Design an enzyme around this catalytic site. Structure first.
Site, mmCIF file in Angstrom:
data_model
loop_
_atom_site.group_PDB
_atom_site.id
_atom_site.type_symbol
_atom_site.label_atom_id
_atom_site.label_comp_id
_atom_site.label_asym_id
_atom_site.label_seq_id
_atom_site.Cartn_x
_atom_site.Cartn_y
_atom_site.Cartn_z
ATOM 1 N N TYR A 1 -1.104 2.166 14.008
ATOM 2 C CA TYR A 1 -0.441 3.191 13.241
ATOM 3 C C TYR A 1 -0.808 4.614 13.657
ATOM 4 C CZ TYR A 1 -0.706 -0.337 9.379
ATOM 5 O OH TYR A 1 -0.646 -1.444 8.575
ATOM 6 N N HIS B 1 0.802 -1.203 0.000
ATOM 7 C CA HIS B 1 0.000 0.000 0.000
ATOM 8 C C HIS B 1 0.833 1.250 0.000
ATOM 9 C CE1 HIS B 1 -3.253 -2.705 1.840
ATOM 10 N NE2 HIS B 1 -3.283 -2.687 0.522
ATOM 11 N N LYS C 1 4.116 7.321 8.065
ATOM 12 C CA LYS C 1 3.468 6.468 9.040
ATOM 13 C C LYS C 1 4.437 6.034 10.136
ATOM 14 C CE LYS C 1 0.989 4.528 4.996
ATOM 15 N NZ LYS C 1 0.900 3.310 4.112
ATOM 16 N N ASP D 1 -5.886 -6.072 -3.426
ATOM 17 C CA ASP D 1 -4.474 -6.378 -3.352
ATOM 18 C C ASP D 1 -4.125 -7.494 -4.310
ATOM 19 O OD1 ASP D 1 -4.204 -4.411 -1.433
ATOM 20 O OD2 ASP D 1 -3.852 -5.796 0.262
#
Lengths: 202, 202
Positions: free
Chosen positions: B133, B63, B73, B170
């Site tokens: 995250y 991603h 992140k 994905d």
């Protein structure tokens, strides 16, 4: 995400939606839009995070930071189940002396914003209970104070049918009233001033 | 806290110390002092956080965010066990095309800082694996793209003995090399400019 103002002035309960698919689940515990809507500015810049894991019956708190400089916090339960408690120890606050509590579990997750100058405690209701925090300033031992969570005057919801498991540092803590008399509690006006700076729109 | 530079330029692995007592355990996954020493400035302002739970064998990724605007992140595994992977997809990077992995477990927890413009993937090695995250920007579906994690050119370590559990998005994602040819990847210089703005000192 839904937001609900708690009884302690400025503290907020956030309830994220839980998204599920064949791989698992997703929540977004902190969201800037919902946060600004409820608080009036964005989260503080994050200085530090905490991941604490606790056994059933553990009580941690009441913790606060000497104000100034003070600390604001954002917490949720990432595993297990906790009764999270916010205590208003800011002298002059319209809700001084009051507490509010939020049940945090994995089926209906909730996060809490803790304003500058308030006290925090929780009790773990299950083993392997994880409390996950964002803090506005790094933990400095000299600036970190405690109050008695077991103070019968306060009547916090920390008894779950077992002998509370409390550290000696938390056990020996003075009470809210004693701290007030000694001039150790945050001032509400001062706390709000700091909070407004920490959560100002850049 | 110890920091280790990963093979992808700018990505960093942080190892917090685990503190233990009769009540449980505590780590500080993100620490400003350590982060500033390793990265050169403090963490981005946090726009959103994520709590993702995955079944064993789930593979999420690769991603990335369209850049600009990009997303940086900071991630750690709050429950379970994951193989966390950072993939350098930034055209012009000195480490373009490389990946690195970090085993994220509960015994010796590690957190990873992912620069703007890199790709991210992970495999859940246990059921109930939670990836936690902090993000520099809120997730916007239209800006969130994918690359093939199964790409033979990368040889990512994502097959662990059970049929991988992968989203349809994905599963059909194109490869990095194909995305490069199509003009779909972040530019390194651009990415670094955004990152510098996000993580500037005062």
């Amino acid at each position: 995400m839904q937001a609900r103002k708690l009884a302690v002035d400025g503290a907020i309960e956030f309830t994220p939606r839980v998204f599920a698919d064949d791989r698992g689940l997703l929540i977004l515990p902190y969201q800037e839009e919902a946060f600004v809507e409820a608080h009036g500015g964005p989260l503080f810049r994050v200085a530090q995070t905490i991941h604490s894991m606790s056994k059933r019956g553990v009580v941690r708190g009441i913790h606060y930071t000497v104000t100034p400089p003070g600390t604001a916090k954002y917490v949720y339960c990432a595993r297990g189940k906790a009764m999270d408690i916010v205590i208003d120890i800011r002298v002059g606050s319209p809700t001084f002396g009051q507490w509010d509590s939020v049940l945090m579990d994995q089926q209906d997750p909730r996060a809490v914003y803790l304003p500058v100058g308030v006290g925090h405690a929780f009790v773990a209701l299950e083993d392997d209970t994880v409390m996950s925090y964002m803090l506005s300033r790094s933990y400095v031992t000299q600036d970190e104070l405690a109050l008695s969570a077991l103070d019968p005057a306060l009547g916090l919801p920390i008894d779950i049918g077992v002998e509370p498991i409390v550290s000696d540092r938390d056990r020996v803590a003075i009470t809210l009233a004693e701290a007030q008399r000694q001039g150790l509690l945050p001032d509400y006006t001062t706390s709000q001033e700091i909070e407004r700076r920490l959560t100002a729109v850049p």
